[PDB]
Scaffold this active site. Structure first.
Site, PDB file in Angstrom:
ATOM      1  N   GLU A   1       1.072  -1.084  -0.033  1.00  0.00           N
ATOM      2  CA  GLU A   1       0.029   0.114  -0.015  1.00  0.00           C
ATOM      3  C   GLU A   1       0.891   1.228   0.043  1.00  0.00           C
ATOM      4  O   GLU A   1       0.605   2.197   0.598  1.00  0.00           O
ATOM      5  CB  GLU A   1      -1.018   0.166   1.094  1.00  0.00           C
TER       6      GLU A   1
ATOM      7  N   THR B   1       0.855   2.714  -9.209  1.00  0.00           N
ATOM      8  CA  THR B   1       0.438   4.051  -9.721  1.00  0.00           C
ATOM      9  C   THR B   1       1.389   4.797 -10.493  1.00  0.00           C
ATOM     10  O   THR B   1       0.944   5.346 -11.568  1.00  0.00           O
ATOM     11  CB  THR B   1      -0.018   4.524  -8.419  1.00  0.00           C
TER      12      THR B   1
ATOM     13  N   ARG C   1      -7.390  -0.457  -6.745  1.00  0.00           N
ATOM     14  CA  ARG C   1      -6.188  -1.215  -6.426  1.00  0.00           C
ATOM     15  C   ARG C   1      -6.404  -2.439  -7.037  1.00  0.00           C
ATOM     16  O   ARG C   1      -7.536  -3.221  -6.511  1.00  0.00           O
ATOM     17  CB  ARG C   1      -6.072  -1.016  -4.988  1.00  0.00           C
TER      18      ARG C   1
ATOM     19  N   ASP D   1       8.353  -3.501 -12.259  1.00  0.00           N
ATOM     20  CA  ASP D   1       8.040  -3.398 -10.809  1.00  0.00           C
ATOM     21  C   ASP D   1       8.093  -5.037 -10.494  1.00  0.00           C
ATOM     22  O   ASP D   1       7.431  -5.868 -11.122  1.00  0.00           O
ATOM     23  CB  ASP D   1       6.506  -3.157 -10.584  1.00  0.00           C
TER      24      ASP D   1
ATOM     25  N   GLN E   1       3.672  -9.967  -3.997  1.00  0.00           N
ATOM     26  CA  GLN E   1       3.302 -10.096  -2.457  1.00  0.00           C
ATOM     27  C   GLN E   1       4.302  -9.364  -1.550  1.00  0.00           C
ATOM     28  O   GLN E   1       5.071  -8.603  -1.847  1.00  0.00           O
ATOM     29  CB  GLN E   1       2.549 -11.338  -2.342  1.00  0.00           C
TER      30      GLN E   1
HETATM   31  N1  LIG Z   1      -5.483   9.210  -1.858  1.00  0.00           N
HETATM   32  C1  LIG Z   1      -4.550   8.958  -2.338  1.00  0.00           C
HETATM   33  N2  LIG Z   1      -4.221   7.380  -2.442  1.00  0.00           N
HETATM   34  C2  LIG Z   1      -2.829   7.246  -3.005  1.00  0.00           C
HETATM   35  C3  LIG Z   1      -2.127   8.231  -3.534  1.00  0.00           C
HETATM   36  N3  LIG Z   1      -1.021   7.821  -3.669  1.00  0.00           N
HETATM   37  C4  LIG Z   1      -0.978   6.227  -4.023  1.00  0.00           C
HETATM   38  N4  LIG Z   1      -2.026   5.924  -3.061  1.00  0.00           N
HETATM   39  C5  LIG Z   1      -2.823   4.835  -3.006  1.00  0.00           C
HETATM   40  O1  LIG Z   1      -2.011   3.820  -3.661  1.00  0.00           O
HETATM   41  C6  LIG Z   1      -2.920   2.704  -4.258  1.00  0.00           C
HETATM   42  C7  LIG Z   1      -2.298   2.193  -5.667  1.00  0.00           C
HETATM   43  O2  LIG Z   1      -2.261   0.901  -5.459  1.00  0.00           O
HETATM   44  P1  LIG Z   1      -1.141  -0.212  -6.165  1.00  0.00           P
HETATM   45  O3  LIG Z   1      -0.844   0.516  -7.592  1.00  0.00           O
HETATM   46  O4  LIG Z   1      -1.431  -1.745  -6.321  1.00  0.00           O
HETATM   47  O5  LIG Z   1       0.171   0.159  -5.125  1.00  0.00           O
HETATM   48  P2  LIG Z   1       0.373  -0.322  -3.683  1.00  0.00           P
HETATM   49  O6  LIG Z   1      -0.903   0.179  -2.997  1.00  0.00           O
HETATM   50  O7  LIG Z   1       1.492   0.157  -3.032  1.00  0.00           O
HETATM   51  O8  LIG Z   1       0.238  -1.945  -3.841  1.00  0.00           O
HETATM   52  P3  LIG Z   1       1.543  -2.877  -4.645  1.00  0.00           P
HETATM   53  O9  LIG Z   1       1.836  -2.014  -5.836  1.00  0.00           O
HETATM   54  O10 LIG Z   1       1.196  -4.126  -4.593  1.00  0.00           O
HETATM   55  O11 LIG Z   1       2.679  -2.271  -3.654  1.00  0.00           O
HETATM   56  C8  LIG Z   1      -4.274   3.347  -4.298  1.00  0.00           C
HETATM   57  O12 LIG Z   1      -5.097   2.187  -3.979  1.00  0.00           O
HETATM   58  C9  LIG Z   1      -4.135   4.444  -3.349  1.00  0.00           C
HETATM   59  O13 LIG Z   1      -5.016   4.139  -2.290  1.00  0.00           O
HETATM   60  C10 LIG Z   1      -2.345   9.537  -3.469  1.00  0.00           C
HETATM   61  O14 LIG Z   1      -1.497  10.439  -3.634  1.00  0.00           O
HETATM   62  N5  LIG Z   1      -3.594   9.851  -2.765  1.00  0.00           N
END
Ligand SMILES: Nc1nc2c(ncn2[C@@H]2O[C@H](COP(=O)(O)OP(=O)(O)OP(=O)(O)O)[C@@H](O)[C@H]2O)c(=O)[nH]1
Ligand SMILES: CN[C@@H]1CCc2c(ccc(O)c2O)[C@H]1O
Lengths: 54, 361, 232, 337
Positions: free
Chosen positions: B39, B44, B169, B191, B195
Site C-alpha cells: 500500500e 500507480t 487497487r 515492478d 506480494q
Molecule cells: N488518496 C491517495 N491515494 C494514493 C496516493 N498515492 C498512492 N495512493 C494509493 O496507492 C494505491 C495504488 O495501489 P497499487 O498500484 O497496487 O500500489 P500499492 O497500493 O502500494 O500496492 P502494490 O503495488 O502491490 O505495492 C491506491 O489504492 C491509493 O489508495 C495519493 O496520492 N492519494
C-alpha cells in the site's frame, strides 16, 4: 491448528525405514569407482589422435 | 560434403549480424527498479508513466474492478462496528445488515440494483460515519471514500471515467513492466511485486540497473502492517530501507526517494485526532531546520514533513561515503502534474552531469 | 673526461621510456594506441650519435627530420582530440553512448613530408648554401610560423577553452578537480611552450644560438614517455 | 494441542538415536589405502562467445555435441561445440530467465524464469522456424529448475516451497509435492527416472517419488542455504553444495553425511556442482571468480580452473565424459578438456 497432526504422522512414517551399515555402502562405492575407471577420459588424458576436440 | 559447411557458415554469419545489430539497441537503454512496502504506490507511478508518455491508456474488466472495490469497502466498515472495543453503533437499517453478512462471503455477486439503494442509505447514517473516523485500529482500503461517494454515476452499466483506473487497487501477482521513450531515449521501468517476501534471493539478478526508486507511505504512521500488532507502518518501511542500503550486491547503486501520499498527510495533520509525538516521542523537541523551502504554508504541517525526511536521510548519510547517494523528493502519485513537475528531476539531471564522467577527476 | 658517459647514459635512459611506452579497451581507449605508437627508439636515439654529424646519406637526413616532425604533430592532434572527446562526453550526456585517427595522421603527413620530399629549403645564403651543399635546420617563407600555428596554436585554441566549461560545472555541482586538471595541462604546456618562443624569434631576426635552440628542442622530447605514465 | 509437539520431539530423538547406532566406521579409514590421483591440468580447448549479459543456466544435449545457454537479456542460442557455430537465436517475452533444458530426443527446449511461466519451444518443425508450443502458468513465485522425463512430461520447482510434475498435452499439474519451509533452488533426476531430490533454503534436502508423490527421507546436516545438487552415476548417493564453503556427500541407504569437502583458505559460496563419468571427481563452481576440483574418496583439492573474470553460475559435464564446460557472468562460456 491441525498442521502438527499430519506432520507427526509423516515423521512416524519416515522413522520406520530400514538402514544398513556404513561399511557396506563404502565398499560398494569403492568397488564401483574401481570397476568403472577405464572409460574416464578426464583422469587419463586422451590421445591427440583420439581426441575430437584437438 | 562442403555444402553443409557452407550452409552452417552462412547461418552463423546471419546470426552474428543480427546479434551485432541488437547489441547497440540493448546498450542504448536505461533501466529502473521500483521498491517499497505494501500500500505504498509502486504501480500507480508506472500507470501514470503509461498515461503520460506512451499513447497507451479491456474497459469491461475495469468496470467490474471498480465495483469490486466498492463492494469490499462497504463490508469492512460495518463488520468492525460490532467488533470494535467502543460501543459505537448507528434503526431500520438493521434489516440491511442481515444480508450484508450473507453477501460478505460469496464466490460471486450479481450486483442487484437493490444493493446500491441500501448501501447508500447506510453510508448516510451518522453512526456509520463515526466508525470511519477511527480507521487507526481496523484496516481499511485508502481508496474507499472516493468510491463510496460516487455510486450513482457508476450505477447509471457504465464506462469508467478518468482517474478511476489510477484509484482502484489491483494486486500484482507477477512482474509488471512498461517501455516508453521520452526524447530519443528509451527507458525501462519494471515492478517486482510478488506480494511480500523476507529473503529476497532474486536481488542478486539486479546488479546492473542505473537507479533504484524507493516509495514510502508518508501518511501512514498510526496503522499496523497487514499482519496485526507488529509495528507502525512507517517503522516497517524504515527497517526495509536500512536493509536495502547495507546490501552486498547493491553496493554501487544510487537511490531516488519518493515521499508519496502527500495530500493525506496534510489533511490528517490539520485534525488533532492523532499526534506524531505519541508514536514518535523525539518529534516533540524537534526544531525545524534553518534551511527550508515550503510550497506557495502552515508551519505545523511543514515541520512534520521534514521530520520524516530527516529520519530517512540520517540512515543513508552514515553507512555511505562515496558511490552511494540519496535523493529526497516530495510527490503525490494521483496528481498527474506533480509527477510531471518532478519530471523525474529534469530527468534527475543533477545526476546526469556529475555522476557521469565527473568522478574520474 | 667525465662527459663521455653522459650521452650514452641518456641514450640508455630513453630506452627505459621506450619500454614503458611499449608496455601499454573501450570507445575512448582506442585513441591512446595512437599516442603509444607515435619514435623514441629510433629518431630520438640518433641524437646521441649525431652529437659527435653522422653523415651517412644526404637522403636520410630528410627522413630523420620528417619522422620527428610528423610524430610531434600526431601527438599534438591526438591530445587535442582526447580533450574534445572528453568535453563532448561531459557537456552533453543525452547522446554519448579509426575514422578520426587516420584523418589526424593524414593531416600530419601533408605538412611534414611534402616540404621535405620537395627538397624546398631556406633562402640561399652563403652559410645556407655551404651547409646544404655539404646538420643545420632552418627554413624560410614563414614555414616555421605556419607549422607552429598548425601544431602549437591548436592547443590554446582547444585545450585552453575545452576545460573552461568543464571546470565551471565543478563549482556549480560541488578540491581534487584542480589537483589533477593542472597536471594534465601543466605538463603539456610547460614542456611545449618554450619552442614557440624561439622558432618565431629565429625567423623574425640573430638573438638566439644554435646550441640553446638544440637544447630547448631536446627538452620536452621526453613528453612521449611522460604521456604514457600520466594516462591510465 | 501442545501435547502433539511431545510426540514429534520423541520421534526426532528416536531417529537421531537410530542414526547414531547405524554408524560403524568413517569412509576415510576404508578409503585411506588407495593411491591419490595426482595433479590435474586442463586448458580451454575452445571458447564460446556471443552473449551480451550474464549467463544463468546451461544444459548439454543428449548427443554431447550441442548445448543451449540462457542469458539475462532474453536470448537462447544453440551452439555447435565442435566447430563453434551458432544454430538458432530464440528471443523471449520476458527478459528475466533463470533456467534452461534440452530434451532427451533433441526436439524441444524449455526456458522458465521469473515470469512464473515455464514455456516450451519447438526446434524441428516445418517452415524452419521456432515458436512457442505451450505455456504453463500454474505456479506462484519464481522458478528455479526445469527437467525433462520424456517428450510429454516436465518437472519444475518454484520458489513457493512446492514442486510439481507437469504434462505437456494437458497443460495442468498431474501431482504436487509439499513439505518444504523455504524456497527451492535445485533438483536432479535419477538415472532410472523414478526418484528426484530438491535442495531448499532451510538447510534441508529430501527424496521425493515421481509416481506415488510423497516424501521418503530427509537430510539436514548443513548450516546454511543450498544452491546445487547432483546424483552419483550409481544412483544411490548425491552431493550437495551449500551457501557456506562446505560440500557434503550423503548416502541414501546409510542416511549419513559421509564427507565434508571444505578448505580453510576459502570463505566463498558454491553455485553448481557435478560429477565425472566414473564418479571419481567432484567439480564445483565457486563465487571467488574461479573453479575448483576435488576428489570423491580423498577430500582434497587436485586442480584449479581460473580462466574466468567473474563468478561461475553454471556447470555441466557431457554424457560421453569428454569435456567439461562452465559459464560465468562476463558473457563468456568456455570448454575444458
Ligand atoms: N488518496 C491517495 N491515494 C494514493 C496516493 N498515492 C498512492 N495512493 C494509493 O496507492 C494505491 C495504488 O495501489 P497499487 O498500484 O497496487 O500500489 P500499492 O497500493 O502500494 O500496492 P502494490 O503495488 O502491490 O505495492 C491506491 O489504492 C491509493 O489508495 C495519493 O496520492 N492519494
Ligand atoms: C629537430 N626537431 C624539430 C624542430 C622543429 C619542429 C619539429 C616538429 C614540428 C615543427 O613544426 C617544427 O618546427 C621538431 O621535430
Amino acid at each position: 491448528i491441525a498442521q502438527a497432526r499430519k506432520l507427526v504422522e509423516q515423521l512416524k512414517m519416515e522413522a520406520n525405514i530400514d538402514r544398513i551399515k556404513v561399511s557396506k555402502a563404502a565398499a560398494d562405492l569403492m568397488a564401483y569407482c574401481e570397476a568403472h575407471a577405464k572409460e574416464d577420459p578426464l583422469l587419463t588424458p586422451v590421445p591427440a589422435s583420439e581426441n575430437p576436440f584437438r | 560434403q562442403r555444402n553443409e559447411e557452407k550452409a552452417q557458415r552462412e547461418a552463423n554469419k546471419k546470426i552474428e549480424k543480427q546479434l551485432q545489430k541488437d547489441k547497440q539497441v540493448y546498450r542504448a537503454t536505461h533501466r529502473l527498479l521500483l521498491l517499497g512496502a505494501g500500500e505504498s504506490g509502486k504501480s500507480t507511478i508506472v500507470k501514470q508513466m503509461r498515461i503520460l508518455h506512451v499513447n497507451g491508456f479491456e474497459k469491461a474488466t475495469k468496470v467490474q474492478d471498480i465495483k469490486n472495490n466498492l463492494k469490499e469497502a462497504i463490508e469492512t466498515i460495518v463488520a468492525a462496528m460490532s467488533n470494535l472495543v467502543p460501543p459505537v453503533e448507528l434503526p431500520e437499517n438493521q434489516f440491511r445488515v442481515d444480508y450484508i453478512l450473507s453477501v460478505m462471503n460469496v464466490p460471486d455477486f450479481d450486483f442487484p440494483p437493490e444493493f446500491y439503494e441500501h448501501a447508500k442509505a447506510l453510508w448516510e447514517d451518522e453512526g456509520v460515519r463515526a466508525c470511519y473516523e477511527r480507521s487507526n485500529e481496523y484496516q481499511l482500503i485508502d481508496c474507499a471514500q472516493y468510491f463510496l461517494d460516487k455510486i450513482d454515476v457508476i450505477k447509471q452499466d457504465y464506462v469508467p471515467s478518468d482517474q478511476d483506473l489510477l484509484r482502484c487497487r489491483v494486486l500484482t501477482s507477477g512482474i509488471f513492466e512498461t517501455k516508453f521513450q521520452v526524447d530519443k531515449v528509451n527507458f525501462h521501468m519494471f515492478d517486482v511485486g510478488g506480494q511480500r517476501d523476507e529473503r529476497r534471493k532474486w536481488i542478486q539478478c539486479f546488479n546492473d540497473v542505473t537507479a533504484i526508486i524507493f516509495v514510502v507511505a508518508s501518511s501512514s504512521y498510526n496503522m499496523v502492517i497487514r499482519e496485526d500488532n507488529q509495528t507502525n507502518r512507517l517503522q516497517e518501511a524504515l527497517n526495509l530501507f536500512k536493509s536495502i542500503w547495507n546490501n552486498r550486491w547493491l553496493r554501487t547503486i544510487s537511490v531516488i526517494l519518493f515521499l508519496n501520499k502527500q495530500d493525506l498527510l496534510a489533511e490528517k495533520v490539520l485534525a488533532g485526532k492523532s499526534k506524531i509525538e505519541d508514536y514518535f516521542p523525539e518529534f516533540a523537541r524537534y526544531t525545524t531546520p534553518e534551511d527550508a523551502t515550503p510550497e506557495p504554508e502552515d508551519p505545523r504541517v511543514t515541520r512534520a514533513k521534514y521530520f520524516i525526511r530527516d529520519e530517512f536521510l540520517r540512515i543513508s548519510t552514515a553507512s555511505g561515503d562515496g558511490r552511494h547517494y540519496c535523493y529526497p523528493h516530495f510527490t503525490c502519485a494521483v496528481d498527474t502534474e506533480n509527477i510531471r513537475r518532478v519530471f523525474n528531476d529534469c530527468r534527475d539531471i543533477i545526476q546526469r552531469m556529475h555522476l557521469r564522467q565527473y568522478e574520474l577527476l | 673526461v667525465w662527459v663521455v658517459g653522459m650521452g650514452i647514459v641518456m641514450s640508455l635512459i630513453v630506452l627505459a621510456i621506450v619500454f614503458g611506452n611499449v608496455l601499454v579497451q573501450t570507445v575512448t581507449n582506442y585513441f591512446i594506441t595512437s599516442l603509444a605508437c607515435a619514435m623514441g627508439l629510433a629518431v630520438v636515439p640518433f641524437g646521441a650519435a649525431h652529437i659527435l654529424t653522422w653523415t651517412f646519406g644526404n637522403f636520410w637526413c630528410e627522413f630523420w627530420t620528417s619522422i620527428d616532425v610528423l610524430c610531434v604533430t600526431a601527438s599534438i592532434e591526438t591530445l587535442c582530440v582526447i580533450a574534445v572527446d572528453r568535453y563532448f562526453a561531459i557537456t552533453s550526456p543525452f547522446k554519448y553512448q579509426r575514422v578520426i585517427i587516420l584523418m589526424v595522421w593524414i593531416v600530419s603527413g601533408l605538412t611534414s613530408f611534402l616540404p621535405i620530399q620537395m627538397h624546398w629549403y631556406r633562402a640561399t645564403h652563403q652559410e645556407a648554401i655551404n651547409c646544404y651543399a655539404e646538420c643545420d635546420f632552418f627554413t624560410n617563407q614563414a614555414y616555421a610560423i605556419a607549422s607552429s600555428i598548425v601544431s602549437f596554436y591548436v592547443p590554446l585554441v582547444i585545450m585552453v577553452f575545452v576545460y573552461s566549461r568543464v571546470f565551471q560545472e565543478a563549482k556549480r555541482q560541488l578540491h581534487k578537480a584542480l589537483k589533477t586538471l593542472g597536471i594534465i595541462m601543466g605538463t603539456f604546456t610547460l614542456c611545449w611552450l618554450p619552442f614557440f618562443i624561439v622558432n618565431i624569434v629565429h625567423v623574425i631576426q640573430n638573438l638566439i644560438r644554435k646550441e640553446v635552440y638544440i637544447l630547448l628542442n631536446w627538452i620536452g622530447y621526453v613528453n612521449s614517455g611522460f604521456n604514457p605514465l600520466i594516462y591510465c | 494441542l501442545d501435547q502433539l509437539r511431545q510426540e514429534a520431539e520423541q520421534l526426532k530423538n528416536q531417529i537421531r538415536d537410530a542414526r547414531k547406532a547405524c554408524a560403524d566406521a568413517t569412509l576415510s579409514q576404508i578409503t585411506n589405502n588407495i593411491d591419490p590421483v595426482g595433479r590435474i591440468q586442463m586448458r580451454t580447448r575452445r571458447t564460446l562467445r556471443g552473449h551480451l549479459a550474464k549467463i544463468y543456466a546451461m544444459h548439454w544435449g543428449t548427443d554431447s555435441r550441442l548445448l543451449v545457454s540462457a542469458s539475462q537479456d532474453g536470448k537462447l542460442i544453440i551452439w555447435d561445440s565442435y566447430t563453434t557455430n551458432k544454430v538458432h537465436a530464440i528471443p523471449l517475452r520476458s527478459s528475466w530467465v533463470m533456467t534452461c533444458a534440452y530434451a532427451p530426443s533433441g526436439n524441444y527446449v524449455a526456458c522458465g524464469g521469473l515470469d512464473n511461466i515455464c514455456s516450451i519451444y519447438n526446434l524441428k518443425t516445418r517452415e524452419g522456424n521456432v515458436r512457442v508450443s505451450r505455456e504453463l502458468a500454474g505456479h506462484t513465485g519464481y522458478l528455479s529448475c526445469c527437467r525433462f522425463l520424456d517428450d510429454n512430461q516436465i518437472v519444475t520447482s518454484s520458489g513457493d516451497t512446492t514442486c510439481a510434475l507437469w504434462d505437456i498435452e494437458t497443460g495442468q499439474q498431474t501431482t504436487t509435492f509439499t513439505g518444504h519451509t523455504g524456497d527451492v533452488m535445485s533438483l536432479s533426476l535419477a538415472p532410472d527416472t523414478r526418484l528426484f531430490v530438491s535442495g531448499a533454503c532451510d538447510a534441508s534436502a529430501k527424496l521425493w517419488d515421481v509416481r506415488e508423490g510423497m516424501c521418503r527421507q530427509t537430510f539436514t546436516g548443513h548450516e546454511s542455504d543450498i544452491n546445487a545438487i547432483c546424483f552419483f552415476p550409481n544412483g544411490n548417493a548425491f552431493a550437495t553444495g551449500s551457501d557456506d564453503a562446505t560440500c557434503r556427500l550423503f548416502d541414501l541407504r546409510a542416511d549419513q553425511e559421509l564427507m565434508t569437502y571444505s578448505h580453510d583458505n576459502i570463505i566463498c559460496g558454491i553455485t553448481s556442482v557435478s560429477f565425472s563419468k566414473s564418479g571419481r571427481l567432484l567439480l564445483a563452481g565457486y563465487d571467488d571468480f574461479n573453479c575448483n576440483v576435488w576428489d570423491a574418496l580423498k577430500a582434497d583439492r587436485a586442480g584449479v580452473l581460473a580462466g574466468h573474470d567473474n563468478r561461475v553460475s553454471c556447470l555441466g559435464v557431457t554424457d560421453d565424459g569428454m569435456a567439461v564446460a562452465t559459464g560465468s557472468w562476463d558473457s563468456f562460456l568456455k570448454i575444458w578438456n
